[PDB]
Amino acid sequence: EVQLVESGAEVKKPGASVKVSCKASGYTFTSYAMHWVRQAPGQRLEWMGWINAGNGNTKYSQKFQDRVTITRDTSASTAYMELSSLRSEDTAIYYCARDKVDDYGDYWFPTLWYFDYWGQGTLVTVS
Amino acid sequence: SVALVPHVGMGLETRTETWMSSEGAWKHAQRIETWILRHPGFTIMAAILAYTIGTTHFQRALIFILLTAVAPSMT
Amino acid sequence: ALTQPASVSGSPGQSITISCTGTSSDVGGFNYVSWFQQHPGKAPKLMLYDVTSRPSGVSSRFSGSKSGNTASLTISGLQAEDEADYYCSSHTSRGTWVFGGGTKLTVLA
Amino acid sequence: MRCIGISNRDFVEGVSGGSWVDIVLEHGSCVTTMAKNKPTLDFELIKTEAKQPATLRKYCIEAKLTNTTTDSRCPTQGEPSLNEEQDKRFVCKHSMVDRGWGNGCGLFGKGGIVTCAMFTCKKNMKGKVVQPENLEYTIVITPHSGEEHAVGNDTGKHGKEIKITPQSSITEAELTGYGTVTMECSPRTGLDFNEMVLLQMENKAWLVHRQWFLDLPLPWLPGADTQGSNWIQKETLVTFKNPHAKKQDVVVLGSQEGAMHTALTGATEIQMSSGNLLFTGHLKCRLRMDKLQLKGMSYSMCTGKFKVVKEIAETQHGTIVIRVQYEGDGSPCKIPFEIMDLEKRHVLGRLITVNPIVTEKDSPVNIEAEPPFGDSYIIIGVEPGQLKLNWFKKGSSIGQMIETTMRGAKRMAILGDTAWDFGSLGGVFTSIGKALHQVFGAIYGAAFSGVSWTMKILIGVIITWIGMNSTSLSVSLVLVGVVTLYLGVMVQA
Amino acid sequence: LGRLITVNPIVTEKDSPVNIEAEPPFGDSYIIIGVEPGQLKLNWFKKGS
Ligand SMILES: *[C@@H]1O[C@H](CO)[C@@H](O)[C@H](O)[C@H]1NC(C)=O
Ligand SMILES: *[C@@H]1O[C@H](CO)[C@@H](O)[C@H](O)[C@H]1NC(C)=O
């Protein structure tokens, strides 16, 4: 069973740095890309970026180019998303999602069933 | 210019008449005729050339008229 | 962004259609049209990807179709448990992902 | 009653063994189908709509040049530089100028120069490409009921409109009192839209070939682009003037939308102001008459008097039409109608509107028939008060042959190989002619791609002259020359 | 006129869509789906020779 485990809720002052942990189990972690999606309470979903566990390359959204950095850990089968210089508007629920990479170990063209599973979500509040 | 490259006579015409069918079917003939009217000396020179290079009368006529067709295309 | 009605309501047991509209680069050019259901206080779950096809474990009541630059979701036989937040997502041409504004589904009592 | 009144109307006779007939439908043209014991129908292609058009290419057509800048460099130190050419929205060109002490540098010779300016596009052209899957064809179905508000009443809901799409080859239409008609068409092979693109002006539109559209020398963005600034090959709409090797100036070339209009000489105009409406092209179809019925076959014979409320009119195809009102009792009943000779011995003409009925006594009916050449007499009603209308037909059977073969040649020329399907019934000769037409037309199109009618005539004359000066090769050459001369003179482009 | 690249198309589950492959001949080609009533007939044309 593919299980996505996320850390607990955290509170931090504005301008701090928060690193969230999403641990995925029950499958070959290296052969799947990992996604991070946020959502303000009562608002729409926003997509930050993805990390390909096969190579570790990075790709982020245009808005989150200079502030969002995401890394991956093969040994723990987890991906860490780190956001620095928090702002009062950053208070949102953060979901980690998974999808399949191609047979060549790359994540150029996403599969049709992307975002196949989702994590329970991490709640971050900014003072 | 785009007018030098008309999308004309390439097999897409149907029962419907085209965008410049009636009044537009005859730009080139009248243009060449007017050019011949206002540029005769070139026409006589072309006739002399057709008389020279051509061996038979048909070749002479072909060269002459079709040279006169070439002539206003570039100008 | 993706434009869609903020709230859609319908009688239970009826057939309703909700539409998500984007641009030519993401919706009108690609088949990466997927719909996700967001329960209040629960993680989002996909109800439909590749609108011409349906996922596994999802009832056949949900049906999706794309007409030009607008992607539509149709639900047959509305029921009480269908009241949840629904999101339309599309993988844009530039390699990123865009999401809709979120829709609240209301079932009359 | 839909076809009656249009010059471009053709007649198809008979059915195949399988009770099917192959026909082709055209915009502005129409065909009427009748058989020995079948109702006569009216067919007309009135609408061709395409969904979700895709912008293949956006051509700029109006431009303006502002924020012009320039600087020079002394001879033999390379080329002048701005911090500015890094941006592609501007247009830049390097020309060559004179320099000297009066020009601000201490060396004499020919110096470099470069100019750049805003390239902002005011009005532009968009080319929409649509897959054959998205096409829709609308056809009106009009049985020859003959009701008084039907002849040419295109704006009235008298006939039945049928919608056919490539997603369903079988489209089925029920006709009240005439059974249910099976309609088969071939939307995909009518016109291969993969090579045509819909060109749209500010308020006008045209259907043009994709390749010629790709070869237009105008600035362009890809259709998927939304920035609206990366105009490719901008030098086609700007001119850099260097009058006397002292100063390079850039000016904007004018508006080519009139020039573009001239460039669309051989194109066909359409509109998409309120949807991609096209009234151009042809649609090959197969008509199945399996379930077509004759209306009012249980109604008895009319016995009362008849009166003419609209006189006989002569169509463009030798057929006649008449409106007659029933004044007797017994409605509904069948209208007596015979085309007899002067001695009433041998039947001469045939009914186009087979065995009509009187729906209502006051409502008049319209009857169509094809009288023979010469004297003809129309007998409506029976004694007492039997109407006998005299008619004369101009022409001759040999004439009829000559214009019908001229029309056949013209339709063959303007359709190509698909014209063999106009009235085909599956004969082996039809298939042989179709194959010969495909091969000959392929060779002909390969040899005459993008050539005008005048030069087609010139080439044909040359070919006939060559054939006349050479036996089998000579006759083949003169035949191909005469047929291509006919094709050139008949084509409007 | 044609042959099936995906030999023996099968419906594993009623609501599960199934992908089918075929190789139509050059010219007019017709795809037959199901049986009467409600049989589907398609009208794809093959470009080539
Ligand atoms: C062009 O010149 C105008 C002058 O009013 C100025 O406002 C504008 O910013 C200039 N554009 C650029 C790209 O420098
Ligand atoms: C067409 O039919 C309608 C309704 O039957 C009628 O009002 C109209 O006058 C008719 N027009 C013609 C030209 O016959």
* CA-wise closest residue to D177 among D334, D288, D296, D289: D296
Question: Residue C19: inside a domain, yes or no?
Answer: yes
List for chain A the helix, strand, coil content (%; round to 5): 5, 50, 45
* CA-wise closest residue to A55 among A34, A76, A36: A34
The backbone torsions φ and ψ at residue D156, rounded to the nearest 5 degrees and listed phi first, read -100, 150
Nearest chain A residue to C36, by CA: A115
Question: Ligand 1 centroid to D118 CA: how many Å?
Answer: 9
Q: Which of D167, D170, D189 comes nearest E45 by C-beta?
A: D189
A26: left (phi over 0), alpha (psi -120 to 50) or beta: left
* CA-wise closest residue to D111 among D90, D122, D95, D123: D95
- D379 & D324 share domain: yes
Burial of D100 (0-12, 13-18, 19+ CB in 10 A): middle
A77, A24 Cβ separation under 8 angstroms? yes
3-class state of residue D338 by DSSP:
strand
Domain limits at C103? Answer: 7-107
Domain limits at D363? Answer: 306-393
Nearest CA to ligand 2 atom 6: D149
N residues, chain C? 109
* D10 contacts on B by Cβ (under 8 Å): none
| Angle (CA) A74 A80 A85, round 5° | 155
Identify the CATH number of the domain in which residue C19 sits.
2.60.40.10
CB contact under 8 A, E43 and D192: no
Look at the block and give the residue holding tokens 């209040």.
Answer: C40
**Are chains A and E in touch, 3+ Cβ pairs below 8 Å?**
no
Structure tokens at B17: 């008449």
| Angle (CA) A122 A125 A127, round 5° | 165
Per the DSSP assignment, residues forming a β-bridge with D240 are: D250
- D361 & D416 share domain: no
Question: Ligand 1 centroid to D292 CA: how many Å?
Answer: 73
- State how far the alpha carbon of D179 is from the alpha carbons of D30, D290, E39, in Å: 22, 9, 21
**Are chains C and B in touch, 3+ Cβ pairs below 8 Å?**
no
Question: Residue C2: inside a domain, yes or no?
Answer: no
Closest CA of chain D from B72, distance in Å: 15
| Angle (CA) E28 C65 D167, round 5° | 15
In chain C, the number of structural domains is 1
Letter string b/e over residues D291-322, b meaning 16 or more CB atoms within 10 A of that residue's CB: ebeebbeebeebebebeeeeebeebebbbbbb
Question: Residue C44: inside a domain, yes or no?
Answer: yes
Identify the CATH number of the domain in which residue D368 sits.
2.60.40.350
Domain limits at A50? Answer: 3-126
Nearest CA to ligand 2 atom 14: D149
In chain A, the number of structural domains is 1
User: Between β-strands C33-38 and C85-91, what pairing exists: parallel, antiparallel or unpaired?
Assistant: antiparallel
Residues in the ligand 2 pocket, defined by CB under 6 Å: D 149, 153, 156
CB contact B53 to D (< 8 Å):
no
**Which residue, among D172, D188, D194, would best test binding to E if mutated, counting the most E CBs under 10 Å from its CB?**
D188
Question: Residue C24: inside a domain, yes or no?
Answer: yes
Expressed in angstroms, the distance from the first to the final Cα of chain A is 37
Structure tokens at A45: 């979903």
Q: Choose one of D4, D140, D153, D158 to mutate for the ligand 2 pocket test, by most ligand atoms within 8 angstroms of C-beta.
A: D153
Domain limits at B32? Answer: 1-75
Question: Ligand 2 centroid to D154 CA: how many Å?
Answer: 9
- State the closest ligand 2 atom to the C-alpha of D150, by its place in the atom list counted from 1: 14
Beta-carbon contacts of B1 under 8 Å, excluding residues fewer than 6 positions away, are: D256, D259
Identify the CATH number of the domain in which residue A93 sits.
2.60.40.10
Structure tokens at C40: 């209040």
- D381 & D450 share domain: no
